Amino acid sequence: KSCCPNTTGRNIYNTCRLGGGSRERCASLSGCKIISASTCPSDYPK
């Protein structure tokens, strides 16, 4: 799932995972926020 203030980041996170890359690897790549239990933080999933 993960949440990102801009699809630009969610893109790397999403594609990253789509390419077999840990959630953290992409997180450090773009800068999205990693949540838990799916539920997203405030409301910045894109």
Side-chain angles (χ1 to χ4, degrees):
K1 246 304 300 138
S2 85
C3 245
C4 216
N6 284 280
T7 159
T8 27
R10 201 129 140 167
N11 268 309
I12 295 92
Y13 209 95
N14 273 251
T15 185
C16 158
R17 257 218 69 74
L18 258 182
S22 345
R23 250 113 49 77
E24 329 200 46
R25 182 192 162 78
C26 349
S28 191
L29 220 291
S30 263
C32 310
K33 197 54 252 241
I34 190 125
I35 350 94
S36 58
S38 233
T39 161
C40 251
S42 269
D43 256 314
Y44 60 104
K46 229 100 163 158

